[PDB]
Amino acid sequence: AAQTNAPWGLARISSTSPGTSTYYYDESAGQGSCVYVIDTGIEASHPEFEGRAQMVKTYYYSSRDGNGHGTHCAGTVGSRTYGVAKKTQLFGVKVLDDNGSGQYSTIIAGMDFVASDKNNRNCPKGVVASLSLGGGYSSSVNSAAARLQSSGVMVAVAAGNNNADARNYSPASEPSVCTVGASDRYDRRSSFSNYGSVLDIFGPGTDILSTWIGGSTRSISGTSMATPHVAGLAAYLMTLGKTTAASACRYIADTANKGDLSNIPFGTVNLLAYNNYQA
Ligand SMILES: [Ca+2]
Ligand SMILES: [Ca+2]
Numbered sequence: 001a002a003q004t005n006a007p008w009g010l011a012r013i014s015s016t017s018p019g020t021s022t023y024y025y026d027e028s029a030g031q032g033s034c035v036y037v038i039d040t041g042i043e044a045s046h047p048e049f050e051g052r053a054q055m056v057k058t059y060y061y062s063s064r065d066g067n068g069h070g071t072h073c074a075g076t077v078g079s080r081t082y083g084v085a086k087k088t089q090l091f092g093v094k095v096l097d098d099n100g101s102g103q104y105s106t107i108i109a110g111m112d113f114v115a116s117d118k119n120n121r122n123c124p125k126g127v128v129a130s131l132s133l134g135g136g137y138s139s140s141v142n143s144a145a146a147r148l149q150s151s152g153v154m155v156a157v158a159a160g161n162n163n164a165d166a167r168n169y170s171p172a173s174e175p176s177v178c179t180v181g182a183s184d185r186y187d188r189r190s191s192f193s194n195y196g197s198v199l200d201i202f203g204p205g206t207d208i209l210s211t212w213i214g215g216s217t218r219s220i221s222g223t224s225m226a227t228p229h230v231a232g233l234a235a236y237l238m239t240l241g242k243t244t245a246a247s248a249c250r251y252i253a254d255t256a257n258k259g260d261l262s263n264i265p266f267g268t269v270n271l272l273a274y275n276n277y278q279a
Helices: 008-013 069-078 104-120 139-150 223-239 248-254
Strands: 033-039 053-058 089-094 126-131 153-158 178-183 201-204 208-212 216-220
Touching: 008 201, 008 223, 033 069, 033 104, 033 223, 053 104, 069 089, 069 126, 069 208, 069 216, 069 223, 089 104, 104 126, 104 139, 104 153, 126 223, 139 153, 153 223, 153 248, 178 223, 178 248, 201 223, 201 248, 208 223, 223 248
Parallel strands: 033 089, 033 126, 053 089, 126 153, 153 178, 178 201
Antiparallel strands: 208 216
16 A cells, blocks of 8 residues: 655655655554554544544543544554554543643553553454653653553553653653654654663654644644654554564564664664565
8 A cells, every 4th residue: 555645754654765755554554453542532533533543541521632632643543644554443541631731640540541451452463552641750650651561562652852861751761662752854853852772763753744633633743743653553563463562662673764863862773663565
């Protein structure tokens, strides 16, 4: 399958080189995988989800995404037009309020929820969790992300938007999950992207077009936007049987575009998520 005039990020993850416009992907497109988007929620009604998205848990008064962040992330994972894994099943877990903020306890609860809830779902190709969120280092938040990973969920988490070492941010600093830095369309590290040794992989993070609340779309920047590319790429590659939840992060790093990024500090991986698709 080839999506012409795709969002630059989708084109980037299916190309060895920047500046392409077509997203090339196996037509399986993450069919049979599940991705939990642990965020502000998902406007499941958005036509771009094609009925493949549903809210499964909220920790606030409504399951409704009143922010747009979660819908944007979910769109990058598996919307028809803006998603890496265009046939994956999306599950919204609303751990962030409609201002996009969430208590650590709530975020931990959402990770514990996914670890259990996946046992109730039909995800024959495996389960991914996209955590486009974070704050200061928390051993309990890292431990929660480690548990979700250990339960057999491919956990992708944002490195963070601090232009600092991800070691001081959670769950970014949890070694066992897939910590995702952001790149721009010119193969630069995104100016805001966290770095450091704990980063596993970069994904497109700057000026990422995706779904938004009210059935709309918008372009926003963040390691929050890079994370769902990797989460979507994990769902995609697990559907193809190329990797498992336990090994997807390592597989994505092993199969990444190596050395394509600029402004990569010494000790940070120079690896950009890449689907290695050959028609
Ligand atoms: Ca290259
Ligand atoms: Ca890691």
